[PDB]
Amino acid sequence: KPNIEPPENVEWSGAEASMFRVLIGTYYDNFCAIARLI
Amino acid sequence: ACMLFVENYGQKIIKKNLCRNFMLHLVSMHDFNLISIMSIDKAVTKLREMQQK
């Protein structure tokens, strides 16, 4: 419901998506370090 | 040990361009206990400093 701002249209590679899934499983909701590593 | 890796195999991994695989291995090792999130960040930052050099 919150965060009404539209998302920026940036595409993700399959490697990027899979490694984001792994890093989300690891770091959970710490999106800062997750984005820093990616 | 992880730090030692980037102290000796960082250049080889960078030349092989397997940095993402190294990060994945670090994540798996952390999931197997030992190391830590801070250790992962420190190792990755040490790896990045090699590429910038």
Side-chain angles (χ1 to χ4, degrees), chain A residues 2 4 6-9 11-12 14-15 17 19-20 23 25 27-28 30-36, chain B residues 1-2 5-6 8-10 12-13 16 21-24 26-30 32-33 36 40-41 43-48 51-52:
Chain A
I4 50 190
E8 301 166 60
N9 215 12
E11 204 41 56
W12 301 126
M19 171 295 308
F20 166 85
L23 257 181
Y27 279 59
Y28 296 112
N30 193 346
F31 300 122
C32 262
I34 280 188
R36 142 177 263 280
Chain B
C2 299
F5 206 37
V6 310
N8 296 338
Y9 290 70
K12 173 169 300 188
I13 289 188
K16 177 57 213 68
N21 267 310
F22 171 51
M23 171 255 288
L24 196 38
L26 278 177
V27 159
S28 175
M29 146 158 291
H30 169 96
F32 261 129
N33 283 332
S36 56
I40 290 195
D41 297 356
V44 170
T45 48
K46 290 310 159 54
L47 176 129
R48 297 297 166 70
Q51 277 185 320
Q52 308 328 94

mmCIF file of all heavy atoms in Angstrom, chain B, unseen atoms left out:
data_model
loop_
_atom_site.group_PDB
_atom_site.id
_atom_site.type_symbol
_atom_site.label_atom_id
_atom_site.label_comp_id
_atom_site.label_asym_id
_atom_site.label_seq_id
_atom_site.Cartn_x
_atom_site.Cartn_y
_atom_site.Cartn_z
ATOM 1 N N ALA B 1 40.483 -16.509 6.756
ATOM 2 C CA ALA B 1 40.739 -17.251 5.529
ATOM 3 C C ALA B 1 40.158 -16.528 4.328
ATOM 4 O O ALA B 1 40.845 -16.344 3.314
ATOM 5 C CB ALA B 1 40.157 -18.661 5.636
ATOM 6 N N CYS B 2 38.912 -16.061 4.443
ATOM 7 C CA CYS B 2 38.288 -15.361 3.327
ATOM 8 C C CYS B 2 39.136 -14.173 2.901
ATOM 9 O O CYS B 2 39.436 -14.003 1.712
ATOM 10 C CB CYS B 2 36.878 -14.918 3.708
ATOM 11 S SG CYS B 2 35.772 -16.280 4.123
ATOM 12 N N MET B 3 39.588 -13.375 3.871
ATOM 13 C CA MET B 3 40.457 -12.250 3.546
ATOM 14 C C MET B 3 41.721 -12.738 2.853
ATOM 15 O O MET B 3 42.113 -12.210 1.804
ATOM 16 C CB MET B 3 40.798 -11.464 4.811
ATOM 17 N N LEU B 4 42.338 -13.793 3.395
ATOM 18 C CA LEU B 4 43.535 -14.340 2.770
ATOM 19 C C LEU B 4 43.269 -14.688 1.315
ATOM 20 O O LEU B 4 44.130 -14.478 0.451
ATOM 21 C CB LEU B 4 44.018 -15.569 3.541
ATOM 22 N N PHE B 5 42.062 -15.177 1.018
ATOM 23 C CA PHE B 5 41.720 -15.511 -0.358
ATOM 24 C C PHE B 5 41.903 -14.303 -1.264
ATOM 25 O O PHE B 5 42.635 -14.365 -2.261
ATOM 26 C CB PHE B 5 40.284 -16.030 -0.423
ATOM 27 C CG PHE B 5 40.020 -16.941 -1.585
ATOM 28 C CD1 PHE B 5 40.983 -17.835 -2.013
ATOM 29 C CD2 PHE B 5 38.802 -16.915 -2.240
ATOM 30 C CE1 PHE B 5 40.739 -18.681 -3.078
ATOM 31 C CE2 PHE B 5 38.552 -17.757 -3.305
ATOM 32 C CZ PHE B 5 39.522 -18.640 -3.724
ATOM 33 N N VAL B 6 41.301 -13.168 -0.898
ATOM 34 C CA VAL B 6 41.421 -11.995 -1.753
ATOM 35 C C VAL B 6 42.828 -11.425 -1.696
ATOM 36 O O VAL B 6 43.212 -10.639 -2.568
ATOM 37 C CB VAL B 6 40.380 -10.920 -1.388
ATOM 38 C CG1 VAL B 6 38.994 -11.532 -1.307
ATOM 39 C CG2 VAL B 6 40.746 -10.219 -0.095
ATOM 40 N N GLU B 7 43.615 -11.809 -0.689
ATOM 41 C CA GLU B 7 45.007 -11.392 -0.646
ATOM 42 C C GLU B 7 45.882 -12.213 -1.579
ATOM 43 O O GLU B 7 47.004 -11.794 -1.883
ATOM 44 C CB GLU B 7 45.543 -11.486 0.785
ATOM 45 N N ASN B 8 45.400 -13.360 -2.043
ATOM 46 C CA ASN B 8 46.220 -14.208 -2.900
ATOM 47 C C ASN B 8 45.538 -14.575 -4.207
ATOM 48 O O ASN B 8 46.205 -14.644 -5.242
ATOM 49 C CB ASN B 8 46.616 -15.487 -2.145
ATOM 50 C CG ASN B 8 47.491 -15.206 -0.941
ATOM 51 O OD1 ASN B 8 48.140 -14.164 -0.859
ATOM 52 N ND2 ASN B 8 47.515 -16.139 0.003
ATOM 53 N N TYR B 9 44.228 -14.812 -4.188
ATOM 54 C CA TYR B 9 43.493 -15.215 -5.378
ATOM 55 C C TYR B 9 42.598 -14.106 -5.915
ATOM 56 O O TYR B 9 41.826 -14.346 -6.848
ATOM 57 C CB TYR B 9 42.662 -16.466 -5.088
ATOM 58 C CG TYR B 9 43.481 -17.720 -4.879
ATOM 59 C CD1 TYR B 9 44.268 -17.879 -3.747
ATOM 60 C CD2 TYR B 9 43.464 -18.745 -5.812
ATOM 61 C CE1 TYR B 9 45.016 -19.022 -3.551
ATOM 62 C CE2 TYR B 9 44.208 -19.892 -5.626
ATOM 63 C CZ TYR B 9 44.982 -20.024 -4.494
ATOM 64 O OH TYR B 9 45.726 -21.166 -4.304
ATOM 65 N N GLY B 10 42.680 -12.902 -5.349
ATOM 66 C CA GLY B 10 41.845 -11.814 -5.833
ATOM 67 C C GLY B 10 42.170 -11.430 -7.263
ATOM 68 O O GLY B 10 41.274 -11.256 -8.093
ATOM 69 N N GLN B 11 43.461 -11.294 -7.570
ATOM 70 C CA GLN B 11 43.865 -10.960 -8.932
ATOM 71 C C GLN B 11 43.473 -12.060 -9.908
ATOM 72 O O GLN B 11 42.995 -11.778 -11.014
ATOM 73 C CB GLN B 11 45.371 -10.704 -8.985
ATOM 74 N N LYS B 12 43.669 -13.322 -9.518
ATOM 75 C CA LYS B 12 43.316 -14.432 -10.398
ATOM 76 C C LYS B 12 41.815 -14.493 -10.645
ATOM 77 O O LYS B 12 41.377 -14.722 -11.778
ATOM 78 C CB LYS B 12 43.818 -15.749 -9.808
ATOM 79 C CG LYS B 12 43.347 -16.983 -10.556
ATOM 80 C CD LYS B 12 44.089 -18.224 -10.093
ATOM 81 C CE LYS B 12 45.584 -18.096 -10.334
ATOM 82 N NZ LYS B 12 46.299 -19.373 -10.064
ATOM 83 N N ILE B 13 41.008 -14.293 -9.600
ATOM 84 C CA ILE B 13 39.557 -14.302 -9.770
ATOM 85 C C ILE B 13 39.116 -13.135 -10.645
ATOM 86 O O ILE B 13 38.246 -13.285 -11.511
ATOM 87 C CB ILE B 13 38.856 -14.282 -8.399
ATOM 88 C CG1 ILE B 13 39.046 -15.622 -7.687
ATOM 89 C CG2 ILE B 13 37.376 -13.976 -8.558
ATOM 90 C CD1 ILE B 13 38.230 -15.759 -6.425
ATOM 91 N N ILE B 14 39.710 -11.957 -10.437
ATOM 92 C CA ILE B 14 39.350 -10.791 -11.236
ATOM 93 C C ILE B 14 39.689 -11.022 -12.703
ATOM 94 O O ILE B 14 38.888 -10.717 -13.595
ATOM 95 C CB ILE B 14 40.041 -9.530 -10.686
ATOM 96 N N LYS B 15 40.880 -11.560 -12.979
ATOM 97 C CA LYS B 15 41.257 -11.857 -14.358
ATOM 98 C C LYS B 15 40.334 -12.908 -14.963
ATOM 99 O O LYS B 15 39.926 -12.795 -16.124
ATOM 100 C CB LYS B 15 42.712 -12.319 -14.418
ATOM 101 N N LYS B 16 39.994 -13.937 -14.188
ATOM 102 C CA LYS B 16 39.011 -14.924 -14.610
ATOM 103 C C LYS B 16 37.605 -14.337 -14.670
ATOM 104 O O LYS B 16 36.717 -14.948 -15.276
ATOM 105 C CB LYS B 16 39.071 -16.125 -13.656
ATOM 106 C CG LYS B 16 38.064 -17.235 -13.906
ATOM 107 C CD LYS B 16 38.180 -17.783 -15.318
ATOM 108 C CE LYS B 16 36.827 -18.232 -15.842
ATOM 109 N NZ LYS B 16 35.912 -17.080 -16.062
ATOM 110 N N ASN B 17 37.399 -13.154 -14.084
ATOM 111 C CA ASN B 17 36.098 -12.484 -14.065
ATOM 112 C C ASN B 17 35.040 -13.344 -13.380
ATOM 113 O O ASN B 17 33.901 -13.442 -13.836
ATOM 114 C CB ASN B 17 35.650 -12.092 -15.475
ATOM 115 N N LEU B 18 35.422 -13.969 -12.265
ATOM 116 C CA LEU B 18 34.523 -14.789 -11.464
ATOM 117 C C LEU B 18 34.209 -14.138 -10.120
ATOM 118 O O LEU B 18 34.008 -14.830 -9.120
ATOM 119 C CB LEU B 18 35.115 -16.183 -11.255
ATOM 120 N N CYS B 19 34.169 -12.803 -10.086
ATOM 121 C CA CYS B 19 33.899 -12.097 -8.837
ATOM 122 C C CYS B 19 32.505 -12.415 -8.310
ATOM 123 O O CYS B 19 32.312 -12.571 -7.098
ATOM 124 C CB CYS B 19 34.065 -10.591 -9.041
ATOM 125 N N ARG B 20 31.518 -12.500 -9.204
ATOM 126 C CA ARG B 20 30.167 -12.851 -8.779
ATOM 127 C C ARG B 20 30.127 -14.253 -8.185
ATOM 128 O O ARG B 20 29.441 -14.492 -7.183
ATOM 129 C CB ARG B 20 29.201 -12.734 -9.957
ATOM 130 N N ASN B 21 30.860 -15.192 -8.784
ATOM 131 C CA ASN B 21 30.924 -16.539 -8.228
ATOM 132 C C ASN B 21 31.615 -16.542 -6.871
ATOM 133 O O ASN B 21 31.237 -17.307 -5.977
ATOM 134 C CB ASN B 21 31.635 -17.477 -9.201
ATOM 135 C CG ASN B 21 30.673 -18.194 -10.123
ATOM 136 O OD1 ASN B 21 29.689 -18.781 -9.675
ATOM 137 N ND2 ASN B 21 30.950 -18.149 -11.419
ATOM 138 N N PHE B 22 32.632 -15.696 -6.696
ATOM 139 C CA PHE B 22 33.279 -15.583 -5.392
ATOM 140 C C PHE B 22 32.316 -15.044 -4.341
ATOM 141 O O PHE B 22 32.290 -15.531 -3.204
ATOM 142 C CB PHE B 22 34.511 -14.690 -5.493
ATOM 143 C CG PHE B 22 35.122 -14.351 -4.167
ATOM 144 C CD1 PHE B 22 35.417 -15.345 -3.251
ATOM 145 C CD2 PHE B 22 35.394 -13.038 -3.834
ATOM 146 C CE1 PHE B 22 35.975 -15.036 -2.029
ATOM 147 C CE2 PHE B 22 35.954 -12.722 -2.614
ATOM 148 C CZ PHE B 22 36.245 -13.722 -1.711
ATOM 149 N N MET B 23 31.525 -14.029 -4.698
ATOM 150 C CA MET B 23 30.520 -13.519 -3.773
ATOM 151 C C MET B 23 29.492 -14.593 -3.438
ATOM 152 O O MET B 23 29.060 -14.718 -2.286
ATOM 153 C CB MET B 23 29.840 -12.286 -4.369
ATOM 154 C CG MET B 23 28.634 -11.794 -3.587
ATOM 155 S SD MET B 23 27.071 -12.206 -4.384
ATOM 156 C CE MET B 23 27.086 -11.076 -5.773
ATOM 157 N N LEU B 24 29.090 -15.377 -4.440
ATOM 158 C CA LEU B 24 28.139 -16.456 -4.202
ATOM 159 C C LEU B 24 28.724 -17.498 -3.255
ATOM 160 O O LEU B 24 28.025 -18.016 -2.374
ATOM 161 C CB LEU B 24 27.748 -17.096 -5.534
ATOM 162 C CG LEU B 24 26.505 -17.982 -5.554
ATOM 163 C CD1 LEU B 24 25.438 -17.377 -4.659
ATOM 164 C CD2 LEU B 24 25.989 -18.160 -6.972
ATOM 165 N N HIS B 25 30.009 -17.818 -3.427
ATOM 166 C CA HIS B 25 30.681 -18.750 -2.526
ATOM 167 C C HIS B 25 30.744 -18.199 -1.108
ATOM 168 O O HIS B 25 30.561 -18.940 -0.138
ATOM 169 C CB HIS B 25 32.087 -19.057 -3.039
ATOM 170 N N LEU B 26 31.021 -16.900 -0.969
ATOM 171 C CA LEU B 26 31.021 -16.284 0.355
ATOM 172 C C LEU B 26 29.645 -16.377 1.000
ATOM 173 O O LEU B 26 29.530 -16.651 2.200
ATOM 174 C CB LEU B 26 31.465 -14.826 0.258
ATOM 175 C CG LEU B 26 32.966 -14.555 0.194
ATOM 176 C CD1 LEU B 26 33.225 -13.067 0.037
ATOM 177 C CD2 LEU B 26 33.654 -15.089 1.434
ATOM 178 N N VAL B 27 28.592 -16.145 0.215
ATOM 179 C CA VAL B 27 27.233 -16.244 0.741
ATOM 180 C C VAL B 27 26.940 -17.668 1.199
ATOM 181 O O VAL B 27 26.366 -17.885 2.274
ATOM 182 C CB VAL B 27 26.217 -15.766 -0.313
ATOM 183 C CG1 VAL B 27 24.831 -16.314 -0.011
ATOM 184 C CG2 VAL B 27 26.195 -14.249 -0.374
ATOM 185 N N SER B 28 27.333 -18.659 0.395
ATOM 186 C CA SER B 28 27.121 -20.052 0.783
ATOM 187 C C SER B 28 27.882 -20.393 2.056
ATOM 188 O O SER B 28 27.351 -21.067 2.948
ATOM 189 C CB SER B 28 27.545 -20.985 -0.348
ATOM 190 O OG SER B 28 27.448 -22.341 0.054
ATOM 191 N N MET B 29 29.132 -19.941 2.154
ATOM 192 C CA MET B 29 29.930 -20.219 3.341
ATOM 193 C C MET B 29 29.307 -19.584 4.577
ATOM 194 O O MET B 29 29.247 -20.211 5.640
ATOM 195 C CB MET B 29 31.362 -19.728 3.132
ATOM 196 C CG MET B 29 32.042 -19.193 4.374
ATOM 197 S SD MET B 29 33.834 -19.237 4.204
ATOM 198 C CE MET B 29 34.127 -21.002 4.248
ATOM 199 N N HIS B 30 28.821 -18.347 4.454
ATOM 200 C CA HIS B 30 28.126 -17.714 5.570
ATOM 201 C C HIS B 30 26.877 -18.498 5.951
ATOM 202 O O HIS B 30 26.575 -18.659 7.139
ATOM 203 C CB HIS B 30 27.770 -16.270 5.222
ATOM 204 C CG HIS B 30 26.831 -15.627 6.194
ATOM 205 N ND1 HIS B 30 27.265 -14.836 7.234
ATOM 206 C CD2 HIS B 30 25.479 -15.654 6.281
ATOM 207 C CE1 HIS B 30 26.223 -14.406 7.923
ATOM 208 N NE2 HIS B 30 25.128 -14.889 7.365
ATOM 209 N N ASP B 31 26.137 -18.990 4.955
ATOM 210 C CA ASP B 31 24.984 -19.838 5.236
ATOM 211 C C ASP B 31 25.387 -21.140 5.916
ATOM 212 O O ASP B 31 24.561 -21.751 6.601
ATOM 213 C CB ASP B 31 24.223 -20.138 3.944
ATOM 214 N N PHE B 32 26.631 -21.581 5.732
ATOM 215 C CA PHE B 32 27.180 -22.733 6.433
ATOM 216 C C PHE B 32 27.837 -22.360 7.757
ATOM 217 O O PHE B 32 28.681 -23.116 8.250
ATOM 218 C CB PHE B 32 28.196 -23.459 5.547
ATOM 219 C CG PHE B 32 27.645 -24.666 4.853
ATOM 220 C CD1 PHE B 32 27.804 -24.830 3.490
ATOM 221 C CD2 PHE B 32 26.976 -25.645 5.567
ATOM 222 C CE1 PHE B 32 27.301 -25.945 2.850
ATOM 223 C CE2 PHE B 32 26.472 -26.762 4.933
ATOM 224 C CZ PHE B 32 26.634 -26.912 3.572
ATOM 225 N N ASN B 33 27.480 -21.207 8.328
ATOM 226 C CA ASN B 33 28.150 -20.643 9.498
ATOM 227 C C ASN B 33 29.620 -20.368 9.206
ATOM 228 O O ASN B 33 30.110 -20.679 8.117
ATOM 229 C CB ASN B 33 27.998 -21.551 10.719
ATOM 230 C CG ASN B 33 26.631 -21.439 11.356
ATOM 231 O OD1 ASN B 33 25.978 -20.400 11.264
ATOM 232 N ND2 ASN B 33 26.191 -22.506 12.011
ATOM 233 N N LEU B 34 30.322 -19.771 10.173
ATOM 234 C CA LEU B 34 31.642 -19.178 9.964
ATOM 235 C C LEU B 34 31.520 -17.981 9.028
ATOM 236 O O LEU B 34 30.541 -17.864 8.283
ATOM 237 C CB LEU B 34 32.648 -20.200 9.424
ATOM 238 N N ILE B 35 32.500 -17.079 9.074
ATOM 239 C CA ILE B 35 32.421 -15.783 8.406
ATOM 240 C C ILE B 35 31.209 -15.023 8.934
ATOM 241 O O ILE B 35 30.586 -15.433 9.921
ATOM 242 C CB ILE B 35 32.365 -15.927 6.872
ATOM 243 N N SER B 36 30.873 -13.908 8.294
ATOM 244 C CA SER B 36 29.769 -13.071 8.747
ATOM 245 C C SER B 36 29.441 -12.072 7.647
ATOM 246 O O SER B 36 30.150 -11.969 6.643
ATOM 247 C CB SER B 36 30.108 -12.348 10.053
ATOM 248 O OG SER B 36 31.291 -11.580 9.917
ATOM 249 N N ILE B 37 28.346 -11.337 7.853
ATOM 250 C CA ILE B 37 27.965 -10.293 6.906
ATOM 251 C C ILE B 37 29.055 -9.234 6.823
ATOM 252 O O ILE B 37 29.426 -8.785 5.730
ATOM 253 C CB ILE B 37 26.607 -9.683 7.298
ATOM 254 N N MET B 38 29.589 -8.822 7.975
ATOM 255 C CA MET B 38 30.700 -7.877 7.975
ATOM 256 C C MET B 38 31.907 -8.457 7.252
ATOM 257 O O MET B 38 32.603 -7.746 6.518
ATOM 258 C CB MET B 38 31.063 -7.492 9.408
ATOM 259 N N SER B 39 32.169 -9.752 7.447
ATOM 260 C CA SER B 39 33.261 -10.402 6.731
ATOM 261 C C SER B 39 33.013 -10.400 5.228
ATOM 262 O O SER B 39 33.939 -10.172 4.441
ATOM 263 C CB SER B 39 33.443 -11.830 7.240
ATOM 264 N N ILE B 40 31.771 -10.657 4.812
ATOM 265 C CA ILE B 40 31.443 -10.648 3.389
ATOM 266 C C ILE B 40 31.695 -9.267 2.798
ATOM 267 O O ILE B 40 32.315 -9.127 1.736
ATOM 268 C CB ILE B 40 29.987 -11.095 3.170
ATOM 269 C CG1 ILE B 40 29.834 -12.587 3.466
ATOM 270 C CG2 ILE B 40 29.538 -10.777 1.754
ATOM 271 C CD1 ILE B 40 28.547 -13.187 2.938
ATOM 272 N N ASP B 41 31.221 -8.223 3.485
ATOM 273 C CA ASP B 41 31.423 -6.864 2.992
ATOM 274 C C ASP B 41 32.902 -6.509 2.932
ATOM 275 O O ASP B 41 33.361 -5.904 1.957
ATOM 276 C CB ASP B 41 30.666 -5.864 3.866
ATOM 277 C CG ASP B 41 29.166 -6.074 3.829
ATOM 278 O OD1 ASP B 41 28.706 -6.947 3.063
ATOM 279 O OD2 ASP B 41 28.448 -5.368 4.567
ATOM 280 N N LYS B 42 33.666 -6.877 3.964
ATOM 281 C CA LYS B 42 35.092 -6.570 3.969
ATOM 282 C C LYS B 42 35.812 -7.280 2.831
ATOM 283 O O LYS B 42 36.648 -6.679 2.144
ATOM 284 C CB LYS B 42 35.706 -6.950 5.316
ATOM 285 N N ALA B 43 35.496 -8.559 2.609
ATOM 286 C CA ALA B 43 36.132 -9.302 1.528
ATOM 287 C C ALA B 43 35.784 -8.709 0.170
ATOM 288 O O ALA B 43 36.655 -8.571 -0.697
ATOM 289 C CB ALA B 43 35.727 -10.773 1.593
ATOM 290 N N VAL B 44 34.514 -8.350 -0.036
ATOM 291 C CA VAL B 44 34.112 -7.766 -1.312
ATOM 292 C C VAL B 44 34.813 -6.431 -1.533
ATOM 293 O O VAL B 44 35.304 -6.149 -2.632
ATOM 294 C CB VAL B 44 32.580 -7.627 -1.381
ATOM 295 C CG1 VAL B 44 32.175 -6.802 -2.588
ATOM 296 C CG2 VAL B 44 31.931 -9.000 -1.443
ATOM 297 N N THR B 45 34.884 -5.596 -0.493
ATOM 298 C CA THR B 45 35.558 -4.308 -0.628
ATOM 299 C C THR B 45 37.037 -4.488 -0.939
ATOM 300 O O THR B 45 37.603 -3.744 -1.748
ATOM 301 C CB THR B 45 35.381 -3.479 0.643
ATOM 302 O OG1 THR B 45 35.682 -4.284 1.788
ATOM 303 C CG2 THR B 45 33.958 -2.965 0.748
ATOM 304 N N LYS B 46 37.685 -5.467 -0.302
ATOM 305 C CA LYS B 46 39.079 -5.750 -0.625
ATOM 306 C C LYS B 46 39.222 -6.220 -2.067
ATOM 307 O O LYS B 46 40.200 -5.882 -2.744
ATOM 308 C CB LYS B 46 39.645 -6.791 0.340
ATOM 309 C CG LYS B 46 39.826 -6.286 1.761
ATOM 310 C CD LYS B 46 40.585 -4.970 1.787
ATOM 311 C CE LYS B 46 40.325 -4.212 3.078
ATOM 312 N NZ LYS B 46 40.617 -5.042 4.279
ATOM 313 N N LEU B 47 38.258 -7.005 -2.552
ATOM 314 C CA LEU B 47 38.275 -7.417 -3.951
ATOM 315 C C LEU B 47 38.105 -6.222 -4.882
ATOM 316 O O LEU B 47 38.772 -6.138 -5.920
ATOM 317 C CB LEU B 47 37.184 -8.457 -4.206
ATOM 318 C CG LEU B 47 37.006 -8.924 -5.651
ATOM 319 C CD1 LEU B 47 37.022 -10.440 -5.729
ATOM 320 C CD2 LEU B 47 35.717 -8.371 -6.236
ATOM 321 N N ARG B 48 37.215 -5.291 -4.529
ATOM 322 C CA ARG B 48 36.999 -4.116 -5.368
ATOM 323 C C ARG B 48 38.257 -3.262 -5.460
ATOM 324 O O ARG B 48 38.583 -2.737 -6.532
ATOM 325 C CB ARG B 48 35.833 -3.289 -4.829
ATOM 326 C CG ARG B 48 34.499 -4.013 -4.849
ATOM 327 C CD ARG B 48 34.076 -4.351 -6.269
ATOM 328 N NE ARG B 48 32.989 -5.324 -6.309
ATOM 329 C CZ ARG B 48 31.740 -5.077 -5.940
ATOM 330 N NH1 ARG B 48 31.370 -3.885 -5.501
ATOM 331 N NH2 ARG B 48 30.835 -6.049 -6.021
ATOM 332 N N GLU B 49 38.976 -3.109 -4.346
ATOM 333 C CA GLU B 49 40.198 -2.311 -4.356
ATOM 334 C C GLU B 49 41.241 -2.892 -5.303
ATOM 335 O O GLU B 49 42.070 -2.149 -5.841
ATOM 336 C CB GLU B 49 40.767 -2.203 -2.942
ATOM 337 N N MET B 50 41.222 -4.209 -5.513
ATOM 338 C CA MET B 50 42.140 -4.814 -6.472
ATOM 339 C C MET B 50 41.823 -4.375 -7.895
ATOM 340 O O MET B 50 42.731 -4.039 -8.665
ATOM 341 C CB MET B 50 42.092 -6.338 -6.356
ATOM 342 N N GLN B 51 40.539 -4.369 -8.264
ATOM 343 C CA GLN B 51 40.155 -3.962 -9.612
ATOM 344 C C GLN B 51 40.494 -2.500 -9.869
ATOM 345 O O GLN B 51 40.959 -2.145 -10.958
ATOM 346 C CB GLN B 51 38.666 -4.215 -9.834
ATOM 347 C CG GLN B 51 38.334 -5.643 -10.223
ATOM 348 C CD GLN B 51 36.870 -5.826 -10.559
ATOM 349 O OE1 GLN B 51 35.997 -5.261 -9.904
ATOM 350 N NE2 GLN B 51 36.594 -6.619 -11.587
ATOM 351 N N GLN B 52 40.261 -1.634 -8.879
ATOM 352 C CA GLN B 52 40.571 -0.218 -9.051
ATOM 353 C C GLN B 52 42.066 -0.002 -9.236
ATOM 354 O O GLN B 52 42.485 0.858 -10.019
ATOM 355 C CB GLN B 52 40.048 0.584 -7.858
ATOM 356 C CG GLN B 52 38.581 0.339 -7.516
ATOM 357 C CD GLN B 52 37.728 0.018 -8.732
ATOM 358 O OE1 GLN B 52 37.522 -1.149 -9.070
ATOM 359 N NE2 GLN B 52 37.229 1.054 -9.394
ATOM 360 N N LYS B 53 42.888 -0.769 -8.517
ATOM 361 C CA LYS B 53 44.327 -0.725 -8.752
ATOM 362 C C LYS B 53 44.667 -1.233 -10.147
ATOM 363 O O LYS B 53 45.574 -0.709 -10.804
ATOM 364 C CB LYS B 53 45.060 -1.540 -7.687
#
